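Quick review question:
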């Protein structure tokens, strides 16, 4: 009985390594080369892996997990009982794979054109406009155009996607797909825990929002910025206003303490995408962690193709389930944002390598937020003025308080501004999945959350047929998003614990854990667990305690909170958006 269960997981592990490796290879080839051929074979390999999943998942459901004594075997078999999309009947499974593929393809090839003019892709062209234009109308053209061409074209698929992904979830014992996604955290109190963390960060976000709104008022004019209202969503330097770092030049706390633009110095010094990933590899090995294998450098796609191929340019990391082949796919641009993304993706590779000897069912992060967090932790050290100067990307600061507050603002525009966005994406999608939001009010309920959580308003009134969620990668690609909210909270917890392990004293935001073998050992022991234990055990190994907590993130930004409160009080800012119904008159 116990011997039958052990033999089962042994056979599942052997056969899954082969099948999953074959699937990963075919998926890699569509993603690196969107064509009709690679499309069809990807859809074919989907049927091979589904057959395997159904064979073993059906066998796994014959075990009463209640009677199994070994907890590791209990845990694997319980997981194999979830067939995911392979629970669908054959006709629905084919339709679902086709719909996912059609949504991804529609998003990846959408363009925005001038009449009798050029056509712009999202990356790099429209992203560059959002980051660098300071003209209200040119930002509006890019912001509206992308929603017109990407978002509106996803709407035709999305109701059927919702129906099929919910049906698969119900066939695996869940009430809807959002219930299935939340279950990955194995935390009954998840929704309440996340709400409490969100509320703890409101003082920082409200003060940053009010300070940035004032600066936008100065640049874009009083007729276009309501000082008691929400901020127009196209003015924050980013297509989704999810990170605000590209308008640093409009909101510098101390303009008398200017700084080299990192991106500008990288190009002046001939940085290349490969050099960016080599620096990330060196940071991991400086901690005593593992280097990426030689195979990685030969097989990864670290820059957009030059030969015309359509590709998915979205940065991602790939485990091929043989313990030796790991790869990144990134349309890397030489700038600071993509330097951080490169570290993000290398953190995934490190996790793959740390848990490669576990059964494949357990080759995942302690929870999805842990997987997204590892690389971001190291990038916090990389981003310090001290580290950037050692890369010859910044002059020496010298402890200047003005430079220090300027650095904290730059970090806040990335990290604090992202918190409400990362909260609201799946607040919206959980309610689509549970039927609270129907297709009649997809877009209206999205904007109600954009207002409630981020304090933003659309610059152009939305119309019937708009589907602005469709204009954000993770929606058509069906990638859960709450993992990034969790990641952004716990990465500061991990930074604080690793800084303490390395003996750093003084303000947390001055810490750089480069070359700390003690910090590497904390990360490695936790990453080796994979998904073999509830995630509080990995939290305990890294931080010395078992809970998610915003206290580290608050500690990191405390000098900035103090400065923002004094600055906002001086100007009499009304925090929040009491005039929440304001929208642009012109
Ligand atoms: C409950 O069951 C747990 C699982 O049992 C395991 O799976 C089932 C299905 C059967 O096959 C079992 O025979 C099998 O053991 C069980 O947890 C296991 O407990 C043992 C100890 O009793 C652990 O064994 C340790 O493994 C270390 C190395 O681990 C990996 O090393 C290889 C590569 O380096 C790897 O190949 C190997 O096998 C895995 O390979 C493939 C990779 O593709 C993978 O897919 C596959 O699933 C295999 O897992 C293995 O994983 C050793 O270092 C360690 O030796 C330690 O002690 C020595 C002194 O005696 C020291 O010299 C040395 O430094 C080490 O400290 C030891 O052999 C096993 O890792 C563990 N498995 C898991 C998943 O946790 C658990 O004990 C059971 N509980 C109870 C109460 O009985
Ligand atoms: C500078 C920086 C750092 C981190 C990110 C993360 C967090 C926000 C989110 C986004 O940009 O909105 N973001 C990605 O998207 C990165 N990329 C993936 O997280 C991949 S690893 C997820 C994936 C994609 C496709 C298939 C499977 C998994 C963005 C920017
Ligand atoms: C891209 O796809 C086409 C059609 O599937 C194929 O002939 C070609 O070899 C592929 N290119 C690469 C670089 O794999
Ligand atoms: Cl939007
Ligand atoms: Cl998630
Ligand atoms: Zn990621």
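Suggested answer, residue by residue:
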């Amino acid at each position: 009985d116990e011997a039958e269960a052990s033999k089962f997981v042994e056979e599942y592990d052997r056969t899954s390594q082969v099948v999953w490796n074959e699937y990963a290879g075919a998926n890699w080839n569509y993603n690196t080369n969107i064509t009709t051929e690679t499309s069809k074979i990807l859809l074919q390999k989907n049927m091979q892996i589904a057959q395997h999943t159904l064979k073993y998942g059906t066998q796994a459901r014959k075990f009463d997990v209640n009677q199994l004594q070994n907890t590791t075997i209990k845990r694997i078999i319980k997981k194999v009982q979830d067939l995911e999309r392979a629970a669908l009947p054959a006709q629905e499974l084919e339709e679902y794979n086709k719909i996912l593929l059609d949504m991804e393809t529609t998003y990846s090839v959408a363009t925005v054109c001038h009449p009798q003019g050029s056509c712009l892709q999202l990356e790099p062209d429209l992203t560059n406009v959002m980051a660098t234009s300071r003209k209200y109308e040119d930002l509006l053209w890019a912001w509206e155009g992308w929603r017109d061409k990407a978002g509106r074209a996803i709407l035709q698929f999305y109701p059927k996607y919702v129906e099929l992904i919910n049906q698969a979830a119900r066939l695996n014992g869940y009430v809807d797909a959002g219930d299935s996604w939340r279950s990955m955290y194995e935390t009954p109190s998840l929704e309440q825990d996340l709400e409490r963390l969100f509320q703890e960060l409101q003082p920082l976000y409200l003060n940053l929002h009010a300070y940035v709104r004032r600066a936008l008022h100065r640049h874009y004019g009083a007729q276009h910025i309501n000082l008691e209202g929400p901020i127009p969503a196209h003015l924050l330097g980013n297509m989704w206003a999810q990170t605000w770092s590209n308008i640093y030049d409009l909101v510098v706390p101390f303009p008398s303490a200017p700084s080299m633009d990192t991106t500008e110095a990288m190009l002046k010094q001939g940085w290349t995408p490969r050099r960016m990933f080599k620096e990330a590899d060196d940071f991991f090995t400086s901690l005593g962690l593992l280097p990426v294998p030689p195979e990685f450098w030969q097989k990864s796609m670290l820059e957009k193709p030059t030969d015309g191929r359509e590709v998915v340019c979205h940065a991602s990391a790939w485990d091929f389930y043989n313990g030796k082949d790991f790869r990144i796919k990134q349309c890397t641009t030489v700038n600071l944002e993509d330097l951080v993304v490169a570290h993000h993706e290398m953190g995934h590779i490190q996790y793959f390598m740390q848990y490669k000897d576990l059964p494949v069912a357990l080759r995942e992060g302690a929870n999805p937020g842990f997987h997204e967090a590892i690389g971001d932790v190291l990038a916090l050290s990389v981003s310090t003025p001290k580290h950037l100067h050692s890369l010859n990307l910044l002059s020496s600061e010298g402890g200047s308080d003005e430079h220090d507050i300027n650095f904290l603002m730059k970090m806040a525009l990335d990290k604090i501004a992202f918190i409400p966005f990362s909260y609201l994406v799946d607040q919206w999608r959980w309610r689509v999945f549970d039927g609270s939001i129907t297709k009649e009010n997809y877009n209206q309920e999205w904007w109600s959350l954009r207002l409630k959580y981020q304090g933003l308003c659309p610059p152009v009134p939305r119309t019937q047929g708009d589907f602005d969620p469709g204009a954000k990668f993770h929606i058509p690609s069906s990638v859960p998003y709450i993992r990034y909210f969790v990641s952004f909270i716990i990465q500061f917890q991990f930074h604080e614990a690793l800084c303490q392990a390395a003996g750093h004293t003084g303000p947390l935001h001055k810490c750089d854990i480069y070359q700390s073998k003690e910090a590497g050992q904390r990360l490695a022991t936790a990453m080796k667990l994979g998904f073999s234990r509830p995630w509080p055990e990995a939290m305990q190994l890294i931080t010395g305690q078992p809970q998610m907590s915003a206290s580290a993130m608050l500690s990191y930004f405390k000098p900035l909170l103090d400065w923002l409160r004094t600055e906002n009080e001086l100007h009499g800012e009304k925090l929040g958006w009491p005039q929440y119904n304001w929208t642009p008159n012109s």
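Why it works: The two ends are 72 Å apart (CA to CA). Residues 2-572 form one domain.
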